[PDB]
Design a binder for this molecule. Sequence first.
Ligand SMILES: CN1CCN(c2ccc(-c3cc4c(Cl)cc(C(N)=O)nc4n3C)cc2)CC1
Length: 272
Amino acid sequence: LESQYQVGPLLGSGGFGSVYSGIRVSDNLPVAIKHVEKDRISDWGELPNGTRVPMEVVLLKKVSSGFSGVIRLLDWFERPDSFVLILERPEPVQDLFDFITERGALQEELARSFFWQVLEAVRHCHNCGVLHRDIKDENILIDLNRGELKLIDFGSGALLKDTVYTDFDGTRVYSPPEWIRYHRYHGRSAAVWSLGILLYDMVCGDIPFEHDEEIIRGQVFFRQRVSSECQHLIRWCLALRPSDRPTFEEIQNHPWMQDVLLPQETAEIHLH
Ligand SMILES: CN1CCN(c2ccc(-c3cc4c(Cl)cc(C(N)=O)nc4n3C)cc2)CC1
C-alpha cells in the first residue's frame, strides 16, 4: 500500500474520514487516498465473496464499472483498525461547495449543465441498485478541464429497495420532511427532494432550509432572480407529499432542462 502509492497533502477530513491527494507509482496516475476508522464506520456490507467491508466499498463496486459521473474505486486495503480506499482523482478539480462559495449563485445555463450531469449520475447509481443518500454540493467534484461532474462519498448510502427506509445518516438539511416527521422515506422520492435542495442551492447560492420547521413547511422563497421554469422545477422536486414529486424522467423532460450544454462546452464557457 505505502509502496504502491506516493502520498501527498491532506485534501480534507470529516464524517467521511481523511482524504489525501496521492499518485499511484505504477504509472503516475493521480489518486485520492481515503482512510476510514473501523470504529467510526456506521453501516457495513458484504462482498460477493462473503468478506465484510464498509458499505461504501460494496456500493462503489456496484457502480464503479464502466464510465459515468461517479468517482471510481481503484482499490481498497484493510488495516487492523481502518480501511483505505483508493479513488480516481481528476486534476485540476474543485468540489461544488467550494465552487459555489467562490462564485455565488450560478447562471442558469451553468446550473442546468451541472444539474443534468448530477441527474445522469444518480440514475446510473439507481440502475446499479445503489442509493447514495447524501446528494449535496459537498459530495460533487468538478473536473475543471473537462467540465464533468463526479459524485463522491457513498458512505451514507444503501442498496436500493422498493420498501420503506427507517434509517438515515446523511445531511439533515437535505433530508425530506417525511424523514423529519416520521423517520420513514422511500429511496427515489427522498433522492428527488435532495435534488430539489441541490438545484435551489445552485441557482440561489445557498440552501433553502436551515431548520426542521422550514423543511416541514416546505415553503420555498427565492432570494435571487430565478426563471419561472426553474422555480417550478424546484418546487416540484420539493413537493411535501413524496408521491407528488417528479420521477427522474419527468425532471429531465421538464422545460427548464432542455438544450443542456455538453460538458466540454460548459468548461469552455464557464470554467475557462
Ligand atoms: C488547492 N486545490 C484545491 C482543489 N484540489 C482538490 C483535489 C482533490 C479533491 C478531492 C478528490 C476527492 C475524491 Cl476523488 C474523493 C473524495 C472522497 N471524499 O471520497 N474526496 C476528494 N477530494 C476532496 C478536492 C480538491 C486540489 C488542491
